[PDB]
A paper describes a structure:
In this study, we discover [name] from the [name] as the founding member of a widespread family of >1,300 anti-[name] immune evasion proteins. We demonstrate that [name] is a phage-encoded sponge that sequesters [name] signals to subvert host anti-phage defense, highlighting viral inhibition of host nucleotide immune signals as a conserved mechanism of immune evasion. [name] is a small 96 amino acid protein that assembles into a tetrameric pinwheel-like structure.
To define the molecular mechanism of [name] nucleotide sequestration and [name] evasion, we determined a 2.10 Å crystal structure of the phage [name] [name]–3′3′-[name] complex (Crystallographic Statistics). Each [name] protomer is composed of a core region of three antiparallel β-strands (β1–β3) flanked by an N-terminal helical region (α1–α3) and a longer C-terminal extension with two helices (α4–α5). 3′3′-[name] ligands bind within each of the four equivalent interfaces creating a 4:4 [name]–3′3′-[name] assembly. The 3′3′-[name] ligand binding site is formed at the interface between two partnering protomers (denoted Acb4A and Acb4B) and a third protomer from the opposite dimeric unit (Acb4C). Contacts between [name] residues Y57A, T70A, and K81C and the diphosphate backbone of 3′3′-[name] further stabilize ligand recognition.
Numbering used by the authors:
A (entry chain A): 2 to 96
B (entry chain D): 4 to 96
C (entry chain C): 3 to 95
D (entry chain B): 3 to 96
The structure:
Amino acid sequence: KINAENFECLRESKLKRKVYEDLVKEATFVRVSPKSTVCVVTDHNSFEVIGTSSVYKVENFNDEIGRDTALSQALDSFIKFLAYSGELSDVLENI
Amino acid sequence: NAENFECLRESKLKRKVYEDLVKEATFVRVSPKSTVCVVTDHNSFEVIGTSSVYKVENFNDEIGRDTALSQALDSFIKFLAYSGELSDVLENI
Amino acid sequence: INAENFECLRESKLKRKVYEDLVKEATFVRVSPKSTVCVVTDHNSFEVIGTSSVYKVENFNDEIGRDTALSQALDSFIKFLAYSGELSDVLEN
Amino acid sequence: INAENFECLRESKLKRKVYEDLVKEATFVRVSPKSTVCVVTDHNSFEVIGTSSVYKVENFNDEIGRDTALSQALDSFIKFLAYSGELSDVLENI
Ligand SMILES: Nc1nc2c(ncn2[C@@H]2O[C@@H]3COP(=O)(O)O[C@H]4[C@@H](O)[C@H](n5cnc6c(N)ncnc65)O[C@@H]4COP(=O)(O)O[C@H]3[C@H]2O)c(=O)[nH]1
Ligand SMILES: Nc1nc2c(ncn2[C@@H]2O[C@@H]3COP(=O)(O)O[C@H]4[C@@H](O)[C@H](n5cnc6c(N)ncnc65)O[C@@H]4COP(=O)(O)O[C@H]3[C@H]2O)c(=O)[nH]1
Ligand SMILES: Nc1nc2c(ncn2[C@@H]2O[C@@H]3COP(=O)(O)O[C@H]4[C@@H](O)[C@H](n5cnc6c(N)ncnc65)O[C@@H]4COP(=O)(O)O[C@H]3[C@H]2O)c(=O)[nH]1
Ligand SMILES: Nc1nc2c(ncn2[C@@H]2O[C@@H]3COP(=O)(O)O[C@H]4[C@@H](O)[C@H](n5cnc6c(N)ncnc65)O[C@@H]4COP(=O)(O)O[C@H]3[C@H]2O)c(=O)[nH]1
């Protein structure tokens, strides 16, 4: 995973940024189609959390925005898992 | 109550999750076409499943609940895979 | 109700435009102690569902729960507008 | 890819009818040790994504991973077909 300063969703969300730096072990991005980017985030147990993005106009495709949008959805689902285990409370106390 | 749902009678896995790990499963008809199932665990964490019939004139309360519960248990299995408790269910068949 | 009541509509002119012109009805239901369901209806009665779930049940707020569920409901609705091509009509106006 | 290779199409007349009449292309990418991604495109190049993640990575199987991901992708496509009313045309042919 690269530095959190690269992703606009991490700069505007304290919660997502904290989850990204502390609880994300690896983060991979793949362009699977002309319009869609897939982001897979893993925790320390290598559990995979998936997020996707799909640009409406394929001629406006941009790797950075696609990765940032896919990562943002991936962290939305990760926060659901952190709420299930209760470890979300640990993240909230550390902001 | 598990006997009343066809998705549980046909799935040993979802029936085992329902009988042992589901605290409550409530159902609400939220619109002419859609039913919402709210599955909660013993820690009161809520898992939401929905269903929507294509033709509104075909709406059946029982089918809507069974479909939304099956979708809700699909999502709950994801949470069980995250915590590792899914292999406890797969251990007990 | 009127679009100005929702914060996500005041902060997003795309979602406000879709809500004002392409949404027939937007109803909300509290389905559980923590979750709120929003059912968005287009002029052909097709149903788009969005949900929200507050982490701390003692922090439940009706307005925030409705606003969050509506915003996610409009995210899914935009996908349907991109499928039919009506998203291009919204982006022009 | 021919529809006979997918178990989800051999078990669902609805999904197999959608795959052959309304699906232009469906590609598969293994994006991680556990997850497979399927990208279904219609004849207007609109993309519908479906994913599958095996619980035990040692049991990863390419066939099951693709079949599960395609079955998930087609479930989402049916929602788009219900929105445009095009699902009624599929029901005419099954
Ligand atoms: N399943 C599916 N959904 C689609 C498709 N085309 C558009 N959508 C949906 O419409 C929303 C708005 O599209 P937009 O292109 O006008 O704005 C896009 C676009 O402005 C930007 N974006 C995302 N990926 C991008 C990318 N790869 N390049 C440039 N911009 C991108 O993020 C915004 C929202 O991404 P999104 O994936 O969450 O939502 C899409 C997406 O959910 C599609 O072909 N298939
Ligand atoms: N977001 C959204 N999705 C819709 C809508 N209308 C249909 N869909 C989707 O089409 C799929 C197939 O609908 P079907 O009516 O032809 O078969 C339905 C229907 O035969 C049955 N079913 C579900 N709820 C029912 C109900 N309340 N009454 C009777 N039958 C019901 O389960 C099947 C699959 O439900 P589903 O929610 O998983 O998938 C829907 C659903 O995802 C809709 O208005 N909004
Ligand atoms: N399936 C499920 N997901 C949950 C549950 N509890 C939390 N989540 C997830 O974590 C987020 C809650 O964190 P937060 O409560 O601190 O911020 C919440 C909360 O600050 C606010 N919010 C939403 N509904 C609210 C409500 N009814 N009352 C007060 N605040 C609310 O919106 C934010 C994001 O809601 P969300 O639905 O998108 O994401 C949930 C949700 O995806 C849960 O019990 N079940
Ligand atoms: N977001 C996320 N979800 C996960 C992860 N690991 C498991 N899950 C979920 O648990 C469900 C049941 O896993 P299973 O491995 O015991 O059965 C799997 C498995 O028996 C089979 N399957 C799917 N992909 C496979 C594959 N690539 N190889 C072998 N079997 C596969 O399909 C079943 C259901 O797939 P699924 O993706 O819809 O649901 C998963 C999945 O939603 C994970 O790491 N991340």
